[PDB]
C-alpha cells in the first residue's frame, strides 16, 4: 500500500506514517506507529525527539489582536528516537519493518501509545469574520532534533503533521428509546397523556428521522400548536462546566386537539449544515486545514465511569412541545405547555477498506 511522508524545509528530516486516522474502540486505541529518516552526518545535536500533543488551541476575544489564539496542552508525551535508547525496546509492526527495510539503516522507528478516556477530534464552526486557525480539539505530531529538550526550537528544524481520533457506531444496537409524559391540572382531575417514540436509537448522517407520537387529551382545553425539534447539546471542560444548546432543524405542526379526544401521527426531520451555515459556534467533526465536514458525530464515553472528561463532549436529544390555550381564572398567568425529551445516538458505520479523504471533488 501507499504511505504518507513530509520533509522539513531544511530537507534533512522526513517522517513516514501508515495513515492519518486512528480508531479508538473506547477500551483500547490503535497504536500509532511510524519511522523517521535521519541524517546524523550534518546533525550535530546528536539527539532526535518526536512528540504527540493533545492541546486546546483557542482564539482570544478581549485581546484586540486578530488571529492570535491561546493553546492549552492537555496531554503531552515525547519519545526520543536518535540515539536509539536500549530501554525503549519495542516490536515493529508488519508495515514498520518493511519501511525500515526499504529506507535502510538511516531510519529509526518510533511509537506512541495514547491512554484511553481522552477527547476525540472535534472542531467548532468558525464565524464569518474568522480568519485564524480552527477552534476545537486536534492532535498533531512534531518531530525535531536538539541537544536538549529545553533548547530553543527552530522553524527549519521541526515538522508538524495533524492526525484525527474518531469513533465508529457499535454493531449491536440497544433497546428502542420511548418516553411518555402525563400532565394534570387544577380545574379538573383529568390527566393529559403524551407518548413519544423513535424508530431506532442509532441513525446515520443524512437519514430521515421518524418519531411516533400519541396524545390523550382529557381536559377541557384545546391544543393549538405542536412543536417538534432536535437540538445539539455541547459539554465543555476547560476550567468549569459549560452547558448550552442549539437547535438544528425545527418543524411546526398545525394540529388541533379537541377536549376529551385523542390523536396520533408521525413526522420526519433531517439535520444538515446547508441551512445552519450562519449559526455560529456549531460543533463539527475533525478538520485538517479547511475541509468541509459533516456535523460532529456523537461521542461515546467509557460506560458509567463517572469520569470528568476534559475537552468537549457532544450529545443529541429530541424535543417535543405542546401549545395549550390560555385564559380562565388564572388568565394568562399559568404555564400549561407540555414537553418531553428523547435522547439518541448518531455515528458513522464501520468503513470497509477506504478511509475518508479530503473533499473528493476538488475544485
Amino acid at each position: 500500500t501507499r504511505v504518507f511522508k513530509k520533509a522539513s524545509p531544511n530537507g534533512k528530516l522526513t517522517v513516514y506514517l501508515g495513515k492519518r486516522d486512528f480508531v479508538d474502540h473506547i477500551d483500547l486505541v490503535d497504536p500509532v506507529d511510524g519511522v523517521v529518516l535521519v541524517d546524523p552526518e550534518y546533525l550535530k545535536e546528536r539527539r532526535v525527539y518526536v512528540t504527540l500533543t493533545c492541546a486546546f488551541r483557542y482564539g482570544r476575544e478581549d485581546l484586540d489582536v486578530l488571529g492570535l489564539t491561546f493553546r492549552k496542552d492537555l496531554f503531552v508525551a515525547n519519545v526520543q528516537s536518535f540515539p536509539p535508547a536500549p530501554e525503549d525496546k519495542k516490536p515493529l509492526t508488519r508495515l514498520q519493518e518493511r519501511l525500515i527495510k526499504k529506507l535502510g539503516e538511516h531510519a529509526y522507528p518510533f511509537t506512541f501509545e495514547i491512554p484511553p478516556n481522552l477527547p476525540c477530534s472535534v472542531t467548532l464552526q468558525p464565524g464569518p469574520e474568522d480568519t485564524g486557525k480552527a477552534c476545537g480539539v486536534d492532535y498533531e505530531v512534531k518531530a525535531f532534533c536538539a541537544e536538549n529538550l529545553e533548547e530553543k526550537i527552530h522553524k527549519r528544524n521541526s515538522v508538524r503533521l495533524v492526525i484525527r481520533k474518531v469513533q465508529y457506531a457499535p454493531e449491536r444496537p440497544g433497546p428502542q428509546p420511548t418516553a411518555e409524559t402525563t400532565r394534570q391540572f387544577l380545574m379538573s382531575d383529568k390527566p393529559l397523556h403524551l407518548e413519544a417514540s423513535l424508530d431506532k436509537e442509532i441513525y446515520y448522517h443524512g437519514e430521515p428521522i421518524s418519531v411516533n407520537v400519541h396524545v390523550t387529551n382529557n381536559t377541557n382545553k384545546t391544543v393549538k400548536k405542536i412543536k417538534i425539534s432536535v437540538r445539539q447539546y455541547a459539554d465543555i471542560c476547560l476550567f468549569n462546566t459549560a452547558q448550552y444548546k442549539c437547535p438544528v432543524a425545527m418543524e411546526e405542526a398545525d394540529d388541533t386537539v379537541a377536549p376529551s379526544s385523542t390523536f396520533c401521527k408521525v413526522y420526519t426531520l433531517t439535520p444538515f449544515l446547508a441551512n445552519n451555515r450562519e449559526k455560529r459556534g456549531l460543533a463539527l467533526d475533525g478538520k485538517l486545514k479547511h475541509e468541509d465536514t459533516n456535523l460532529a458525530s456523537s461521542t461515546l464515553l467509557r460506560e458509567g465511569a463517572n469520569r470528568e472528561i476534559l475537552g468537549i463532549i457532544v450529545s443529541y436529544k429530541v424535543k417535543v412541545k405542546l401549545v395549550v390555550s390560555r385564559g380562565g381564572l388564572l388568565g394568562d398567568l399559568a404555564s400549561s405547555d407540555v414537553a418531553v425529551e428523547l435522547p439518541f445516538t448518531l455515528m458513522h458505520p464501520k468503513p470497509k477498506e477506504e478511509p475518508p479523504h479530503r473533499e473528493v471533488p476538488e475544485s
Epitope: 443524512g206 437519514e207 475544485s363
Partner: antibody, heavy 119, light 109 residues
Framework: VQLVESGGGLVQPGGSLRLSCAAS????????IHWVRQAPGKGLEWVAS????????YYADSVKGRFTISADTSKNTAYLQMNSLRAEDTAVYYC?????????????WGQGTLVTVSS | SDIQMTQSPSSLSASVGDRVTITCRAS??????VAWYQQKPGKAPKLLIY???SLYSGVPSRFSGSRSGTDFTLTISSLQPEDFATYYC?????????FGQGTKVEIKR
C-alpha cells in the same frame, strides 16, 4: 433502489426542456446526484452535479450559463434546467446516484433518455 | 484544472480465455482516485473497479487492475463470452469529471 427518469423529446434549437430524475429506495440528503451525456458515436461526458447536504452546485464549462440543476426534498426527485439549446447538444442523457459519505464511483445509473435538438 | 486521459490501445480482438490488459495514463498526479466502467451496447454503463484497485460487490474475480505511477492498468485473466463490450477509465480527484474515449472488445475469428 430503482432510478427512473422522464421528460425527453425533440425540440427546436434554442428551447428548453424538463428532465426529472425520480429516485426510489433512498433519500437525496444522503446521496449526490450527477448527470452525464454521451453523443451518438462518442463517449460519455459529465454535465452537472448537485449536493443536497452542502447545498453546492457544479456545472461544466461547455454548458455554463445555459444549464441549471434543481432538486425537491419532498419526494426525492430532481429537475434539470436547460435553456438556449444547441443542435450539437443532442445526445443520450443519464441520471446517476453516488454515495455522499463518501465518493466511491458511480454505482447506480438510470435507464437513459434520448434528446433531439434539430430544426 | 482539467485532466486528459488517453486510453490505449483503441480496440483489440482476442479469443476466449486469453489474458488481456489495458493501460490508463494521467496528465498529472491523481493518487488512486480512479475507477473503471463497462457498458454493453445499448445499455447503461456498469461499474467494475473503484479506487483503481478495489473490486465492486458481486463481480467475478477474473477482473483485475493495477497501478504504476501515472500509468494505470486493468487486466482480465480469462475471457468469458459476455466480457466483450466497451470499457472506460475514470479519475475523480479534480473537477470537472473528465471521461475517456473507451476501448471496444470483440471476439477473434
Amino acid at each position: 433502489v430503482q432510478l427512473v427518469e422522464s421528460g425527453g423529446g425533440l425540440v427546436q434549437p434554442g428551447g428548453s426542456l424538463r428532465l426529472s430524475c425520480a429516485a426510489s429506495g433512498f433519500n437525496v440528503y444522503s446521496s449526490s446526484i450527477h448527470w452525464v451525456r454521451q453523443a451518438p458515436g462518442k463517449g460519455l461526458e459529465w454535465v452537472a452535479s448537485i449536493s443536497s447536504y452542502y447545498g453546492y452546485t457544479y456545472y461544466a464549462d461547455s454548458v455554463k450559463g445555459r444549464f441549471t440543476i434543481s432538486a425537491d426534498t419532498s419526494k426525492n426527485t430532481a429537475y434539470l434546467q436547460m435553456n438556449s439549446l444547441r443542435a450539437e447538444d443532442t445526445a443520450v442523457y443519464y441520471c446517476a446516484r453516488s454515495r455522499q459519505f463518501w465518493y466511491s464511483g458511480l454505482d447506480y445509473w438510470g435507464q437513459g433518455t434520448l434528446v433531439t435538438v434539430s430544426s | 484544472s482539467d485532466i486528459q486521459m488517453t486510453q490505449s490501445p483503441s480496440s483489440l480482438s482476442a479469443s476466449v480465455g486469453d489474458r488481456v490488459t489495458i493501460t490508463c495514463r494521467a496528465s498529472q498526479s491523481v493518487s488512486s482516485a480512479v475507477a473503471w466502467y463497462q457498458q454493453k451496447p445499448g445499455k447503461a454503463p456498469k461499474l467494475l473497479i473503484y479506487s483503481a484497485s478495489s473490486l465492486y460487490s458481486g463481480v467475478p474475480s477474473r477482473f483485475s487492475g493495477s497501478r504504476s505511477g501515472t500509468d494505470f492498468t486493468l487486466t482480465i485473466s480469462s475471457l468469458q463470452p459476455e466480457d466483450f463490450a466497451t470499457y472506460y477509465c475514470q479519475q475523480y480527484k479534480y473537477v470537472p469529471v473528465t471521461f475517456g474515449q473507451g476501448t471496444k472488445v470483440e471476439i477473434k475469428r
